């Protein structure tokens, strides 16, 4: 069934390109200077970026504005991921509650995984690659906002040293979604059955796409440990931001859209 | 590596695991499932039978200090095992220490699962058996100390690993190049690369019907990392509430800065 695993890999890659506008291939071409993006490195260039990079989220404090900007984009990504999951063979046949449970607990790990595609050591692409926020500008943010963003850079630097491309990541993402260990799942067996195929598919993909990179399969799986740990730490930052930043108050309809 | 070389590394590690850990999973299962009239444990399920166990083999504190002493013993055995992992003792000293500092706990809960079923845990080299319910009913935060380890053990034991498997898995845990503060990640990763290859072949040969067991076993490393985190936070809570309590220097040092 080797031919079958190559086929599943091809299916997921095609769906991945369609579901996610800014591919890792495209983002790397932009970061490496290969139509140049707008750069945000201080407060003034941010003010000129809102009226130039036309962020879809301007509705008075700067660090809050950035954090909520990250929140809005993440809510957009949850919809893109939801559309991608539907293409995973077997996903839409699962019990409806279980699909909702797999997406509820998986989007956070997928977002961080995919955010690494947009980062280098020096910053992160934004607005489908038209803007660029420097690591230094993010690390220097006041309050606990400065420490929210630096962990994602540290993880992305380690993670990106694996040198995965989009065809690799498309299967990795599918594998995260089909985690049979999410709390409250009603029928674990078909989820773990699908994950086995995706796991076979990822293993073959990495041997063929990285024949020199020994044990790349194992090493990528160990990155799920790091992902789970950073999602957990991130949650505890939200609780602190909710309970300390009353300036982080929103319009009730807005609070409601962004509560997840 | 060549298959014959990986089999040789697997055999070396199994051999050293038998030498370093006196109570193997094989022995613990023979005691837990029994039929054996020579290996039968005394069962501790309440306060009185605990008192009768003292004459055969605050209450919640005594138990906690019991786990602490056994934990130090486990660290000693794990440290003796690590020394046998080819390449380990040639590494920079600080990294040897760093690998053990972050590795021993994940290995302790791994091997603790061998001593557990759904109903309790072997103790005192298999001569006793403390029920899960009795531990869950301990007062203050102590009742919540041991139950996460049970939840992991039930799932982990469903993998049906034996000792030859665990020996290689334990080795892979120690040689993690992602531990905070490592100075020379490359030589650690080259060793883990060999150990990961050895584990792959071993699980394929010993569990050929167990699809993707290699992948499933590695994902269990996620669950280990989370239970270590919870344990540490409980220790900080007990430290600030029981000032009469005290820790072993080996344990003291493992918990400083995660
Ligand atoms: O394109 C994406 O998929 C994408 C996804 C996440 C982020 C981003 N999210 N984020 C969070 O805190 C966060 C995460 Cl990880 C997960 C869930 C909720 C949150 C929440 F709610 F808190 F925001 C960051 C913290 C630090 C950094 Cl450097 C980036 C992030 C970004 C960065 N911005 C962006 C804006 C426009 C266009 C492209 C990019 C992009």
From Swiss-Prot, chain B:
Cross-link (Glycyl lysine isopeptide (Lys-Gly) (interchain with G-Cter in ubiquitin)): 19
Record-listed rosiglitazone binding positions: 68-71, 105, 231, 255
Keyword ATP-binding found: no
Region entry Interaction with FAM120B, spans: 2-47
Sorted UniProt keywords: Activator, Biological rhythms, Cytoplasm, Diabetes mellitus, Disease variant, DNA-binding, Glycoprotein, Isopeptide bond, Metal-binding, Nucleus, Obesity, Phosphoprotein, Receptor, Transcription, Transcription regulation, Ubl conjugation, Zinc, Zinc-finger
Localization (cell): Nucleus; Cytoplasm
GO CC terms of this entry: chromatin; cytosol; intracellular membrane-bounded organelle; nucleoplasm; nucleus; receptor complex; RNA polymerase II transcription regulator complex
Chief place of localization: nucleus
Tissue and organ expression note: Highest expression in adipose tissue. Lower in skeletal muscle, spleen, heart and liver. Also detectable in placenta, lung and ovary.
Activity regulation remarks: PDPK1 activates its transcriptional activity independently of its kinase activity.
NR LBD domain boundaries: 5-257
Induction: (Microbial infection) Expression increases when incubated with M.tuberculosis or its lipoprotein LpqH; induction is TLR2-dependent (at protein level).
One biological process term in Gene Ontology: negative regulation of SMAD protein signal transduction
Keyword Manganese: no
Transmembrane segments: none
Motif 9aaTAD, residue numbers: 249-257
UniProt GO molecular function: alpha-actinin binding; arachidonate binding; chromatin binding; DNA binding; DNA binding domain binding; DNA-binding transcription activator activity, RNA polymerase II-specific; DNA-binding transcription factor activity; DNA-binding transcription factor activity, RNA polymerase II-specific
Posttranslational mods: Phosphorylated in basal conditions and dephosphorylated when treated with the ligand. May be dephosphorylated by PPP5C. Ubiquitinated by E3 ubiquitin-protein ligase complex containing FBXO9; leading to proteasomal degradation. Ubiquitinated at Lys-19 by TRIM55 leading to proteasomal degradation. Ubiquitinated by E3 ubiquitin-protein ligase STUB1/CHIP; leading to proteasomal degradation.
Known disease link: Defects in PPARG can lead to type 2 insulin-resistant diabetes and hyptertension. PPARG mutations may be associated with colon cancer.
Domain remark in the UniProt entry: The 9aaTAD motif is a transactivation domain present in a large number of yeast and animal transcription factors.
Family membership noted in the UniProt record: Belongs to the nuclear hormone receptor family. NR1 subfamily.
Function noted in UniProt: Nuclear receptor that binds peroxisome proliferators such as hypolipidemic drugs and fatty acids. Once activated by a ligand, the nuclear receptor binds to DNA specific PPAR response elements (PPRE) and modulates the transcription of its target genes, such as acyl-CoA oxidase. It therefore controls the peroxisomal beta-oxidation pathway of fatty acids. Key regulator of adipocyte differentiation and glucose homeostasis. ARF6 acts as a key regulator of the tissue-specific adipocyte P2 (aP2) enhancer.
Quaternary structure annotation from Swiss-Prot or TrEMBL: Interacts with FOXO1 (acetylated form). Heterodimer with other nuclear receptors, such as RXRA. The heterodimer with the retinoic acid receptor RXRA is called adipocyte-specific transcription factor ARF6. Interacts with NCOA6 coactivator, leading to a strong increase in transcription of target genes. Interacts with coactivator PPARBP, leading to a mild increase in transcription of target genes. Interacts with NOCA7 in a ligand-inducible manner. Interacts with NCOA1 and NCOA2 LXXLL motifs. Interacts with ASXL1, ASXL2, DNTTIP2, FAM120B, MAP2K1/MEK1, NR0B2, PDPK1, PRDM16, PRMT2 and TGFB1I1.
Protein name: Peroxisome proliferator-activated receptor gamma
High-level lineage: Eukaryota, Metazoa, Chordata, Craniata, Vertebrata
Gene: PPARG
């Amino acid at each position: 069934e080797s031919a079958d695993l190559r086929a599943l890999a091809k299916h997921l890659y095609d769906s991945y390109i369609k579901s996610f506008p800014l591919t890792k291939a495209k983002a790397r071409a932009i970061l490496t200077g290969k139509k140049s993006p707008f750069v945000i490195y201080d407060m003034n260039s941010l003010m000129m970026g809102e009226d130039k990079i036309k962020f879809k989220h301007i509705t008075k404090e700067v660090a809050i504005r950035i954090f909520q900007g990250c929140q809005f984009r993440s809510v957009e990504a949850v919809q893109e991921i939801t559309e991608y999951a539907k293409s995973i063979p077997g996903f839409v046949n699962l019990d409806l509650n279980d699909q909702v449970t797999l997406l509820k607990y998986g989007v956070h790990e997928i977002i961080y995984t995919m955010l690494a595609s947009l980062m280098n050591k020096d910053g992160v692409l934004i607005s489908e690659g038209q803007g660029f926020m420097t690591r230094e500008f993010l690390k220097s943010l006041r309050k606990p906002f400065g420490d929210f963003m630096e962990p994602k850079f540290e993880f992305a630097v380690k993670f990106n040293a694996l040198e995965l491309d989009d065809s690799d990541l498309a299967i990795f993402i599918a594998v995260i979604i089909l985690s049979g260990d999410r709390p409250g799942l009603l029928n674990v067996k078909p989820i773990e059955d699908i994950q086995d195929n995706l796991l076979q598919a990822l293993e073959l993909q990495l041997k063929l796409n990285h024949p020199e990179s020994s044990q790349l399969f194992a090493k990528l799986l160990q990155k799920m440990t790091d992902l789970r740990q950073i999602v957990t730490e991130h949650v505890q930052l939200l609780q602190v931001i909710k309970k300390t930043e009353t300036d982080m108050s929103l319009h009730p309809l807005l609070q409601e859209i962004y509560k997840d």
